[PDB]
């Protein structure tokens, strides 16, 4: 029952995904191959991180998850093959995926292959690993790879070889964790009472904004449930609300609410409406909270 | 041979439907996930049961369809499961799909899971139902769900449990008929000699115009194929031709036509043109037939 | 496992691929269906042309290539079903796809299904093809097939049945090859010492330009790895660059890079950035080229 | 997926087996087909039930048992399909098989098949059945059968139409209880302090003594591991021994020891040694036991 | 889903089986392999003749017919693989099998594989063929064959090539018809209204006696169901009874009866007792039969 | 695709082996079971031996083989699991199996289990071994293990373990050389010119007799093909005929034929005949050769 989770930046109007899927078929006779998605911006490391660092729990133990955008497609540059340790925990509260309690995760049961640029920075940040190595072996890797096309040539065609049961250690030389590239991001700061952070996404399709402050920076401040805030997004415009566990919480259609999303941010949107799409409001854009 | 047809307002720009459907693996590891559609303007409902309406008799019987936007999440409402009678025959003119005279479908064998928001509205009015029931046990959803994330707690997860062959009848208790929440469905209003309907979608990517004007609204006043016809649509635009079976009836690329859709409703486009681009035509506008 | 490869002029915004989706695992339980993809501009063949023809090499023997745009639906026109005879050597150096020398196809391994309008042009060209037939039989196609609706009932219902292993010859008379449509593709012209061509696309999302002007074209007046260049675009727009590998071969991040793409072409793009969308570069301009 | 586990008394020197092994693959392509054993007495179907009693444990869920001696072939008699109760823990001390803990079975997982001769006693007797049907439908047998080989046309044939998923239900009318046929069963009966029984079997190829003695029989008489036991056989031979676990309990080659079989039955044998071939002890031979 | 069905004089007592077998997977991984029988008199094609026979009839399409006794092992003899015409119907009325109507078989549907020693004689006869073929190409047979392992090397190797789709005539030269060996068979005798043939085989386990008067010799003297007959074995037993379809017609356990079997032969039997064996009845003994 | 090769001395005349198999079905569903054979001499591991030492080259590659007689069932004796180092090349000549020029077969590529009681003694000596295990892991074994049934509990269950993939190096702790018992191999011994050994079996069905005398036994000796040789069978049976490949180079049918068998060892036999049963020879009956 091998699954591929795939992630890229390699579009929805072309054959470029295609091309990545009949080799993984090819390698894996009976994989299941899943795509995350395959729209995001071009070299954007820190985006790309965000659609692939909550993925494990939901997903059957032995996971390969194949995620790449290649800026230095043709290089010296190589990819990375990780087991990771700890399935996280995640949510607004801290749970497994499932119905019931949940589907509890064992350790070290899956397997992140990405270039080596930073795309995994946040997957170890939450994760951790237990091993890592560069891709390289013959086996795995084209003998004469196509200089263009590094996703396909350096993460589908391996990913696939994983899935399909090529031991680990036998795709390369073992990493030192200091080889292992990371991008670098400004922490929430404090300031008083106030957290300081930014607007990490845009939620799309409902414009709802998510912020890059924790549950665990709020309840630094104290802050949990009940606690009537204030949101001030641009520098320049203020929110009011209590925080509060959804969006039906704030009474009419349309009203503010402050809450926890599901990767367990503070976010601001509005009852069932776009609070994001009217006002032009962006990622990167200032974001302070206080009681 | 488990299938689960997929339907939501989730996007396909970030990880949330991954997350759905991994999931729907974990849950039932021999399932076939199959995408519906996944763009749809969140909060339509209408738009949503568009697209699912027509789904039951192209695919093999036992398919679970979970179809989802939940603008209530994190309430009390709760998801129903329904399974419907007839797969209904379709076509432009009443059939059953597939090869040689069609693949027929046995009653009682196909069903949704949807959140009770009228969703199923179309559904249920086109292929009547067996039975019904609320999505309670928490043998099927999480017992503790995400608040902000019902699709995936209250449709996604408890789906593939059906799939996987979860008794229909122990998911919760059963419900009577006005406990489904039904949008309304605004008649067709007869005026003169004209019938008063309004543009219901466009036909993306071809721009087609489909209305809310039945064959048997025609009917009810006389007009049907062969007949010459003036559609107005927003009060100021006019067209006219006869009824015909195919855009290329017309003649020249770019001749309107005017047809039943491949679902039985009053329809008009351009032969291997877009009608509705270049004028900018929308869902919502008023159209007006006469002989 | 038998693989169907599909790619529509459908859209992904309504449930139209999933219908034929449905018919697909009715008709063939076993099937894995791949998308490639389904976004191309209705009724432009030589789109969609570019999308399936770089695709055999990729995929395991017995596939079956589902692609269709149907322009001409309801009427007289049938769909043609061939059996390639070379999966043919791709990308920028001409080799198998894969890990290792790459994964060598036999030949007459593939089945391609289309409309009998012209979508197969290069496949043809490029492929060969054993066997062609016109696609009329009861047992592969509805009895009755909704007029709208072409490619579902003339091609992916059949796919299908090719799918499951339905003799390829029982489809319907055979075809000479005069009665397959193909479309006309511009030769490259001559001026001065300077092969002159077109930009047949824009690769998405990169903003990478895409010339007609193959390898062989360039080997026929002299140019490999590292001859400076001067190539004009839509008659005003001039570039100039030696022939490099990749886009890290231009230096600093936006520096021009001139190269062959992974299908083998002249293309022009910038390193790690856009080059197209900040000028509106577009399918279409004239594309001049001199050492 | 699919199993049947086959048993009859058709031998192992012809065809007639393969036929019907035929039969089943034609019908439930996917079957897999387990050989129980052939090569029982014809028509001795208290043997015949030894063979099948003990089977369901050992078997994954949805197993099909085909088990069949047909003395009565030709004539108005119909086979009776059955859905048995529990799998009901074996053992000389009560448990599931497997490794680990054994493998948990749940209530209503097999299917038996066979002559409504008698062969199926033993089954009932120790694992109940939820429902029970007459097997007349031509959906399932021959229209016209084949008067001399009921095994084939009434067991084998049906056998997989219900691997295949057939409903049960819809092979015939229900049966109540009296009209299942059982054979009459040899009471323990007792004589003073002693148990008279018989011998039940000989253990092929070791030469192993069986009886008709249940560990419940002697929990009655206060007998259980490291009791002194002696036991006549045929009405003239006797043996004296404790009761053991095991053979090599018994300490030198070919010493006697008395111990419970994998059926929990009170049993004689030899350590490494025939006891039954040096002797002729035979079927169906007195035995008595007394502390 | 491909088959291969293996009757040879092999034994069951040794590895020899499991040797041909694990070269049968190794050649085609999806094969299933059917035991025929494998404990014929070595040497006696008579016999092996009579277990293959009846055989395609009972399985499906494409089954490659796998059947060896070689006392010509090492010599330049060579195998002949043939395509049979008609799989003919069979049994006592003459009827395809399988439930309902039972399975037709298209013509040209299996292939035979033996020694060219006669072992094909009653197959031929029954079935016709339309293609025969020396069994000698490098492809499918070893280069250098064991000497005294014929059965393996010159059939089960071959059988599985054949089942894996290499083309038939492939294997070597077309054979005339007389170049296929048969062995003589004796026939019918007409003596005013009665018939003198022989008894061909004893029925295990059972012990019936199968003579070789076909029903087509009886119905040709006038003989049918309800004759009073007169049997004459031995020359000196003339057994008296009605023809009747089944052993339970002739009332008493024991009795005898007289029938066809399921080949269409005349037999002889008791009701549920057994014939041959207590009167040491024997293959050779005359066969007379008379109203 | 996974095998286990089988092999026992449980007979075939009741379900012992059928319940071996419907756990190895339970464990991993996919295997294919292959049947060495099941009627050797109880607690005889010589003969055992014997019929699984030559399987491997047969095979493909990954095969499990589940060898099993279980003399010390219910003691503290435990299975030992080993991975073979060569699989040899066998036969008369030296060779691989298969055709053309045989299917090579890489090192360590097969699994055998057996109890701990020399059954493999034979294979190492063929095939050496990189790892050797006691199996002991309640992964693989049952918790509470049957006394009378180790066949089942200690080799079948976990052979189907390994075949499912669990990692060989996990029943248990590593085995030394000489934890792993061997039985007595009374060699060949030379005469002076004379060669001295003893018929190590009768080949059923066929009553060819088989010595413990090895080609390189007869190379060594400057004996081969072609030479004029004297064989005295129980000593005083003195046969004289020269060494041939095989027995049809006897001349006429019964002649006496003197050559090496398929597993390389010197032979004696008739042609087309039995010598073994006629004359009651038998395994253990001395054998000398000379020229």
Not at 184 to 192: F, I, L, M, T
Not at 196 to 201: F, K, T
Not at 224 to 241: C, I, N, Q, S
Request: glycine residues 10%; charged residues 20%.
């Amino acid at each position: 029952r091998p699954i591929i989770a795939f992630m890229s930046d390699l579009g929805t109007t072309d054959d470029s995904v295609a091309q990545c899927k009949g080799l993984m078929y090819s390698i894996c006779p009976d994989v299941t191959v899943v795509d995350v998605c395959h729209s995001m911006t071009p070299w954007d490391v820190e985006e790309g991180a965000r659609y692939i660092v909550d993925l494990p729990r939901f997903f059957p133990e032995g996971t390969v998850f194949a995620t790449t955008t290649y800026p230095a497609t043709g290089t010296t540059t190589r990819s990375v093959a990780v087991r990771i340790k700890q399935a996280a925990k995640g949510g607004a509260r801290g749970q497994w995926a499932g119905s019931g309690a949940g589907f509890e995760r064992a350790e070290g049961s899956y397997i992140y292959i990405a270039p080596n640029n930073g795309l995994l920075t946040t997957v170890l940040e939450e994760h951790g690993y237990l091993e890592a190595y560069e891709v390289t072996s013959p086996k795995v890797i084209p003998e004469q790879p196509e200089p263009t096309f590094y996703s396909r040539e350096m993460v589908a065609i391996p990913s696939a070889h994983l899935a399909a049961g090529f031991p680990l250690s036998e795709v390369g030389r073992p990493l030192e964790d200091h080889e292992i590239v990371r991008f670098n991001r400004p922490a929430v700061e404090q300031d008083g009472e106030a957290l300081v952070g930014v607007v990490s996404a845009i939620d799309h399709p409902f414009g709802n904004v998510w912020t890059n402050i924790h549950r665990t920076d709020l309840e630094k401040a104290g802050i949990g449930y009940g606690a009537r805030l204030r949101l001030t997004l641009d520098g320049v415009l203020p929110f009011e609300a209590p925080l509060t566990p959804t969006f039906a919480d704030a009474g009419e259609i349309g009203n503010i609410a402050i809450y926890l999303n599901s990767r367990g941010y503070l976010s601001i949107a509005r009852n069932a409406a776009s609070l994001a799409y009217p006002y032009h409001l962006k990622e990167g854009m200032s974001a302070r909270v206080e009681a």
